[PDB]
Design a protein around this nucleic acid. Structure first.
Length: 48
RNA sequence: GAGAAUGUCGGGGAGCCGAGGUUGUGAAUUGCUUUCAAAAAUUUUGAAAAGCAAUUCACAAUAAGGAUUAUUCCGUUGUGAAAACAUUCAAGGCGGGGCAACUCGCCUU
């Protein structure tokens, strides 16, 4: 921060694909599975 | 000026529910008034009936009304003479959801 800025409200936060983030955090809490189960199709199915 | 994304503040419409209140029916108790109808000294006491109620409980209706048997409803909104409308509105197919009814998406006319 001491040397740059990013053209946007310097104290504002912007959504960055929160959906898959939540799905992934909760699908990581589940454990006892491979770290590849969350694919695009499975993500869409969970969201639906 | 237009659009897309992200926040803030407001506005509108629709929907699933809840608690009273009011009026009326019945009951428990206590009253006011009138009349009967006795007893007693125009006045006092007692039974019955009617009017008006109070406190509490169960129940019925809650815009007059009109449908219907679906676990459905229309009745205080706007336009305007057509007493006619708006506020529901096609067809398929490929899927998700469930105990299933039913609910949420995708594809082409």
């Amino acid at each position: 921060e001491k040397t740059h800025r990013w053209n946007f409200v310097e104290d504002k936060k912007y959504p960055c694909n929160e959906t898959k983030t939540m799905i992934s955090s909760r699908l990581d809490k589940v454990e006892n599975i491979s770290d590849d189960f969350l694919t695009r199709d499975i993500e869409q199915k969970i969201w639906h």
